[PDB]
Every structure is written in structure tokens, then in C-alpha cells.
């Protein structure tokens, strides 16, 4: 997260880290056995880390639980990035660390959201934080999103952020949450660099997937 602030320990209790010997992606806990993340975060052998603040130290609220299933959307396209969503089942239920609700309706342009993660905090250069970082950012209109990324924005994507630059998600934040009025509306997905002027972050539009998420979770 570039341009953000220190959340505070366990103030984002639905944020998880996906670990493959090191932190590589975030995710969002949506019930005691299931996490939502990005399809491009698929790996075998994922361990989900819940209750984290400092990713590099054991502080004691942690739960480390293996993924028993890692289910990429059947229509994920790894070239266009359409349908960038993945559901991870936990091998044992997490002790509730708390889940976040799925949306009942899509969010509109200008809605303020909370984006969080353990990704790079520099827009030019590299600094990875120990503790979880937070950013408040608004959803942007589809028209502005498509002028920022011509030919690239599908109906399952939205932009969020600040066109002047300096505030954005960055490498290491993928798969993590964009929460707006207590609902998981987005998944950190892609952008052009990070926190660049005129290049807001692009997010998977979770509201389009709620029936699929519910049915897929219940069928596994």
C-alpha cells in the first residue's frame, strides 16, 4: 500500500496473508472455512495466515491453516485478467479474526472504501512493511476507468483511487480486500505501476460473483 497508514494490530480482522514460504498475496476471510483472493494468486501448497499484524514476527494472535482447496474462477483469463477471483478452502475452520460480508448490491462511483495489505509502500523503489497498512480510497466511474486503461476494462473490473497519484495498492497487496460500508466489494488485481498519476488501481468487482461464490463454497 503506497500513501497509506498503519492500520493497527488486528483492526482489519478479515485480512489474511497467503504464504508459500513467504508472503506473496492477501485475501479476505468470508466465513470460518473460506477465503476470497485473486486468481493470479493461485499456487499449490498455500498456507493461510489469519490474525496477523507483523508478518515477520510471531505475536500470538496468529492462526496458520493450510489451504485444502484453491479454486480459480472457471472463466479466469490470464491474458485479459477477466474474472480474477479465487476461493480458498481452509483445511480446518478458523477460530473467530472475523469474516467480512459479501455485497448485496454493487457500490457506486465515489463510495469510500478501505484497501489493506502488506505490499510495497513505495511508488518508485521497494520497501515492504512489517505491519499491515490501510488506505481509504473512492470507487471511480467506469468511464474514467476505461479512459485510464483503454481496451482493458471489462464488466468485472472497477478502478479505485486518486488520479493525482501517490495513493494506491502495490505488489504484495493482490488478492486482498476493498471493503466499502462493511462489504467486500473488490479484490486487489492489477494496474499500471503503482500510485502513478492517471493510473488508478484496478480491482475485481466482487458484486458480480456473489451467487457464484455462495454456490461454489456450498458445493465444496
Amino acid at each position: 500500500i503506497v500513501g497509506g497508514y498503519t492500520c493497527g494490530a488486528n483492526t482489519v480482522p478479515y485480512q489474511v496473508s497467503l504464504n508459500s514460504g513467504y508472503h506473496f498475496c492477501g485475501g479476505s476471510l468470508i466465513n470460518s472455512q473460506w477465503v476470497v483472493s485473486a486468481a493470479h494468486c493461485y499456487k499449490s501448497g498455500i498456507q493461510v495466515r489469519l490474525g496477523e499484524d507483523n508478518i515477520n514476527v510471531v505475536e500470538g494472535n496468529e492462526q496458520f491453516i493450510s489451504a485444502s482447496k484453491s479454486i480459480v474462477h472457471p472463466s479466469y483469463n490470464s491474458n485479459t485478467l477477466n474474472n480474477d477471483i479465487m476461493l480458498i478452502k481452509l483445511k480446518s475452520a478458523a477460530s473467530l479474526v472475523a469474516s467480512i460480508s459479501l455485497p448485496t448490491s454493487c457500490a457506486s462511483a465515489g463510495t469510500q472504501c478501505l484497501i489493506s495489505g502488506w505490499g510495497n509502500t513505495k511508488s518508485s523503489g521497494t520497501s515492504y512493511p512489517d505491519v499491515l497498512k490501510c488506505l481509504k480510497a473512492p470507487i471511480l466511474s467506469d468511464s474514467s476507468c476505461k479512459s485510464a486503461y483503454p481496451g482493458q476494462i471489462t464488466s468485472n473490473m472497477f478502478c479505485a483511487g486518486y488520479l493525482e497519484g501517490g495513493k494506491d495498492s502495490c505488489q504484495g497487496d493482490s488478492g486482498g480486500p476493498v471493503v466499502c460500508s462493511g462489504k467486500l466489494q473488490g479484490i486487489v488485481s492489477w494496474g499500471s505501476g503503482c500510485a502513478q498519476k492517471n493510473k488508478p488501481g484496478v480491482y475485481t468487482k466482487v458484486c458480480n460473483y456473489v451467487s457464484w461464490i455462495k454456490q461454489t463454497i456450498a458445493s465444496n
Binding site: 508472503h23 485473486a38 494468486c41 491474458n79 510495497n120 505488489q171 504484495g172 493482490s174 492489477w190 488501481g201
Partner: protein
């Protein structure tokens, strides 16, 4: 030669460690891959990188 191209993070926002052949150094080295749109100088192990690019 794809082994001579600089490593490509790509537009996705993961922090995945991959290997690339560094021809300046004559070494397979690590870099951050964002999770999508990989180019070919991008390997999951040092052994795969050396096998494909060693000596380029």
C-alpha cells in the same frame, strides 16, 4: 534472445519470487513477479533458469 531481456514484473500486484537470467552478472537472480503476463525470462527455480538460459 529472451534470456537477455530484463525481468518483467507485469501489471498484477502479487509479490511472487521468481528467477531471471542476468547476463551482465552471468547469474540466475531473483526478482518480484506480480502474478500475470510473465515473459519467458521468468523461472520458478534457479535450476530451471540455468537449464534454459545458462551461458546466454
Amino acid at each position: 534472445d529472451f534470456c537477455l531481456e530484463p525481468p518483467y514484473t507485469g501489471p498484477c500486484l502479487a509479490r511472487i519470487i521468481r528467477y531471471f537470467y542476468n547476463a551482465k552478472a552471468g547469474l540466475c537472480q531473483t526478482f518480484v513477479y506480480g502474478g500475470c503476463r510473465a515473459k519467458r525470462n521468468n523461472f520458478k527455480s534457479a535450476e530451471d533458469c540455468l537449464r534454459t538460459c545458462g551461458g546466454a
